[PDB]
């Protein structure tokens, strides 16, 4: 017998592979598993882990988010890296000329980047030209703006969104939401 | 692949501790102490033998 301080046989709880069966994604993982092992550049390990992520955990990255990132001083010539999808954003009217490396590009995003004079690159071409992630800018989309996140942690005085089908008057706007009817949460 | 215990397996005892060879050669485990001849004071002997 052993007085176990920790739970036995506990899995790490981190993805060690993509749940996806996409063969090309698994080839990209084959590439960055090699690069993470045979280089000491932290970029390769970060990209590898991002390659494992689920869909909600790799939100879209907008071209305007990329352009804002390129406004960081000393960052205007960095290769933006997005382990995910880059979407188009018509709310920006001046896009800079830059090389963006991403898993997926939408048609609008690719057209906007190319029309700016820039380049759209796959992650393997990024691995060829920046094996240690040289001069790279990893960008991530907003995880907590998901609709599902609105409803997490619901409870009195927490101010989250109730899980509700129909909205408007008559749908949870009464006793429990105003002092005139009972109380307010 | 196999833990060879020092304190036997003289070879492993010599891989660790190069000083074991000098220790055994000079018999430092059977070292004589110089014969000094001090004697406890009378108060000590009387106290010890007190009832």
């Amino acid at each position: 017998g052993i007085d176990h301080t920790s739970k036995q046989h506990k899995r790490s709880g981190h993805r060690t592979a993509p749940k996806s069966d996409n063969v090309y994604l698994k080839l990209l993982v084959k590439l960055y598993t090699f690069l993470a092992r045979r280089t000491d550049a932290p970029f390769n390990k970060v990209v590898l882990k991002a390659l494992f992520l689920s869909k909600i955990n790799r939100p879209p990255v907008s071209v305007s988010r990329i352009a804002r990132a390129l406004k960081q001083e000393g960052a205007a010539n960095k290769t933006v890296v997005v382990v995910g999808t880059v979407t188009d954003d018509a709310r920006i009217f001046e896009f800079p000329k830059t090389t963006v490396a991403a898993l997926r590009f939408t048609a609008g995003a690719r057209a906007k980047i190319v029309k700016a004079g820039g380049e759209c690159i796959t992650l393997d071409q990024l691995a060829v030209r920046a094996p240690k992630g040289q001069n790279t800018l990893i960008l991530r989309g907003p995880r907590n703006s998901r609709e599902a996140v609105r409803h997490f942690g619901m409870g009195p005085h927490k101010g989250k969104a109730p899980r509700i089908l129909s909205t408007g008057r008559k749908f949870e706007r009464a006793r429990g939401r105003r002092r005139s009817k009972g109380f307010k949460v | 692949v196999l833990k060879k215990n020092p304190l036997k397996n003289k070879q492993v005892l010599l891989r660790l501790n190069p000083y074991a060879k000098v220790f055994a050669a000079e018999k430092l485990g059977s070292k004589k102490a110089e014969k000094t001849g001090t004697k406890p004071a009378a108060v000590f002997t009387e106290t010890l033998k007190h009832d």
């Binding site: 052993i2 007085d3 | 020092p6 406890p40 000590f44």
Partner: protein, 222 residues
């Protein structure tokens, strides 16, 4: 011609100089040990010769063996036993003696036997049952380079350097002692010497402080 010979010649000569260093440090330690023990022996004789008493300095180190199984342990003793890394029966470890640790031993007396370990018992314990904690794994010492790669930044280049840091409770005792995986001892080879273990050593049992008799017990289990 990959120039393997230059690497081999440099690496063998490096091995010889490290071994010369360890050799001269083991000789100095042996001088330090024998000089110390003869100093206390003579100091006792001279105090008696002068009508005084030499009160030997209180022991700085204890070796603790958990002698009780895992079930039915109250939660405070259970926590202390985990903090002393005695997670199973007949596991043993070294503890540096201060008030902060003597109170822990007070809390876990009915579950452990401890006492003051001699140089010989420390040496045999480290030599036979000595394992290092390296990248969370239990690694047999078995070679000085394993010790130097993990404790060399404290000046501990050999298994005897480690033993020296333990017995003479040095500035890096804590790092050296934690590096050592908790010794996993056997049952005593000639039995415990008692009919019933779970009474104090004073009471005719096995547990509690049995100060210099811990050496005989640990030697039997080792």
């Amino acid at each position: 011609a990959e120039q393997v010979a230059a690497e081999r010649a440099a690496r063998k000569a490096a091995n010889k100089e490290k071994r010369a260093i360890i050799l001269e440090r083991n000789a100095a330690y042996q001088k330090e040990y024998e000089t110390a023990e003869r100093n206390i022996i003579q100091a006792k004789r001279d105090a008696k010769a002068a009508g005084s008493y030499y009160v030997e300095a209180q022991h700085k180190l204890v070796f603790v063996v958990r002698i009780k199984g895992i079930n039915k342990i109250p939660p405070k003793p259970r926590k202390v036993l985990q903090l002393l890394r005695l997670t199973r029966i007949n596991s043993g470890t070294f503890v540096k003696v201060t008030k902060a640790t003597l109170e822990l031993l007070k809390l876990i007396e009915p579950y452990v036997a401890y006492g003051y370990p001699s140089y010989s018992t420390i040496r045999q314990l480290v030599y036979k049952r000595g394992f290092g904690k390296i990248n969370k794994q239990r690694v047999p010492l078995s070679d000085n380079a394993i010790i130097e790669a993990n404790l060399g930044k404290y000046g501990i280049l050999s298994i005897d350097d480690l033993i020296h840091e333990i017995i003479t409770v040095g500035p890096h005792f804590k790092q050296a002692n934690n590096f050592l995986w908790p010794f996993k001892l056997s049952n005593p080879s000639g039995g415990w010497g008692v009919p019933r273990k779970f009474k104090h050593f004073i009471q005719g049992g096995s547990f509690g402080n049995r100060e210099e008799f811990i050496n005989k017990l640990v030697k039997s289990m080792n």
